[PDB]
Amino acid sequence: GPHMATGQDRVVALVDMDCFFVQVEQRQNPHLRNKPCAVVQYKSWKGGGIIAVSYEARAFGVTRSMWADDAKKLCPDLLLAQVRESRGKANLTKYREASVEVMEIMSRFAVIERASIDEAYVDLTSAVQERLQKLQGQPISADLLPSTYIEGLPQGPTVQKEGMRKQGLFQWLDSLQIDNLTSPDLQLTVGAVIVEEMRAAIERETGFQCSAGISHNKVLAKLACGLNKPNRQTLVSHGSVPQLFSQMPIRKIRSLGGKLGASVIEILGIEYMGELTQFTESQLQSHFGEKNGSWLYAMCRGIEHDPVKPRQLPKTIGCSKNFPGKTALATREQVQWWLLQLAQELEERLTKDRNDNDRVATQLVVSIRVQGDKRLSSLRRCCALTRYDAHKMSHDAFTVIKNCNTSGIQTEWSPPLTMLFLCATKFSAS
DNA sequence: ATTATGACGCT
DNA sequence: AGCGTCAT
Numbered sequence A: 001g002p003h004m005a006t007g008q009d010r011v012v013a014l015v016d017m018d019c020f021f022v023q024v025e026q027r028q029n030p031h032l033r034n035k036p037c038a039v040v041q042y043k044s045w046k047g048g049g050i051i052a053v054s055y056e057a058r059a060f061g062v063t064r065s066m067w068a069d070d071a072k073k074l075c076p077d078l079l080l081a082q083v084r085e086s087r088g089k090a091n092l093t094k095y096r097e098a099s100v101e102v103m104e105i106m107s108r109f110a111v112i113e114r115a116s117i118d119e120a121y122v123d124l125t126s127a128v129q130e131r132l133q134k135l136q137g138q139p140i141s142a143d144l145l146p147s148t149y150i151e152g153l154p155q156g157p158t159v160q161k162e163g164m165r166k167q168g169l170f171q172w173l174d175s176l177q178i179d180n181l182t183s184p185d186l187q188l189t190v191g192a193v194i195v196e197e198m199r200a201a202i203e204r205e206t207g208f209q210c211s212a213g214i215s216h217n218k219v220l221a222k223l224a225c226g227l228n229k230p231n232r233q234t235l236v237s238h239g240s241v242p243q244l245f246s247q248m249p250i251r252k253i254r255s256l257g258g259k260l261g262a263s264v265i266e267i268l269g270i271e272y273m274g275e276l277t278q279f280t281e282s283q284l285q286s287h288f289g290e291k292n293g294s295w296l297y298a299m300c301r302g303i304e305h306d307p308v309k310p311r312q313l314p315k316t317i318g319c320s321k322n323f324p325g326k327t328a329l330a331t332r333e334q335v336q337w338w339l340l341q342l343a344q345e346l347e348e349r350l351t352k353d354r355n356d357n358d359r360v361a362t363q364l365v366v367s368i369r370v371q372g373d374k375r376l377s378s379l380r381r382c383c384a385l386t387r388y389d390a391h392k393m394s395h396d397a398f399t400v401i402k403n404c405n406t407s408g409i410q411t412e413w414s415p416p417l418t419m420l421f422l423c424a425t426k427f428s429a430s
Numbered sequence B: 001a002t003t004a005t006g007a008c009g010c011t
Numbered sequence C: 001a002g003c004g005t006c007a008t
């Protein structure tokens, strides 16, 4: 009862860019705006691989991971923008720089945690408190929430989508108790007002649209964000959780989309997140471990305590390339040339990072894959990163991997390498 | 031949 | 440390 924690202590948002790489290309090339279009990397093999898809193109069934030649079968008028190639490889610099544009705007409102190239968590608890006091107990007008959905509403006692949105928003606002400054529902609502402001700022200052989730923790905020995309935001209240989770496949919750989630389903014989409430914490810990068990017990009740970490910059800077099928590297000269290409991109990015962010990487991680292994990485080795010099880094990378070569002949490389990966890690202030 | 990343957990 | 998982 009264001592039962409800995980309503924080206001957390997740802001995620809509079809991000496509918007970056659409800003650059107005011919692509408001069109079925996708971003592709490489081209020779099956037209290139799609990595981002506009919502117009999704209507035709175009998806990520599709070959462009195959996407064209679904959508003959599909427009394409290609990822830049430098030093023989895809180069994602344009999108990383566009990401920084957005992250720096978000950071004006609150502490953010960079969660991917196109999304960040926001801890809005303090900002909400401040806005609540400037608000002096006045009601919140629907006009302040023009793109907000309230998950679970409307309910009870109609045709258009925007009509439904407003109906639900009005039910929510009509029920709000605005003279309690510690009401979690009110806090979420004020959070949503701030996120409208944040999203407007992002669009005004970059041209990019985004969606957002507002809830009491990161997992619910992420889930919320996806419920109404694109260009909308969704508030998931604590009270909405039992109905929301009652038909929510376990795999939809962040961290449960893989083997652990499959094991929860198989071992317990359930399908939906809500069904987890019928197990004791000890039961869940017995199957999934102490940490996962406790996390699942709380999470299926809408409760999670993972903090929004104050980190805007990536912790590592890496460069990787696959060499599939017959392109697998089979000579020492090949392996060395590509290590140099990777190292040259890495040096460029590291040198910029040092100037921008007052830090230096101190460790170089080298990873490779060998033909026939279908693990992502076959082998990882580290060495000291003491100078931002591509020839040195590529020589050092070669040194730590050269013994992987089972070939008798020095020139030849066996078994052929199907992936190379250089990663700069362990940053120190500089 | 579903590529190029990036964070965090386990032992 | 080196490997595995999950993610976008």
Ligand SMILES: Nc1ncnc2c1ncn2[C@H]1C[C@H](O)[C@@H](COP(=O)(O)OP(=O)(O)OP(=O)(O)O)O1
Residues within 6 Å of the ligand: A016, A017, A018, A019, A020, A021, A022, A051, A052, A053, A064, A117, A118, A229, A230, B003, B004, C008
């Ligand atoms: N598996 C991947 N491989 C390479 N790049 C990816 C992959 N997944 C995502 N990206 C890139 C391209 C995306 O535009 C960008 C952001 O990803 P993501 O948020 O999942 O989708 P999205 O922004 O393209 O559309 P959405 O509107 O559904 O969020 O990151």
Ligand SMILES: [Ca+2]
Residues within 6 Å of the ligand: A016, A017, A018, A019, A020, A118
């Ligand atoms: Ca996105």
Ligand SMILES: [Mn+2]
Residues within 6 Å of the ligand: A016, A017, A116, A118, A119, C008
């Ligand atoms: Mn994303």
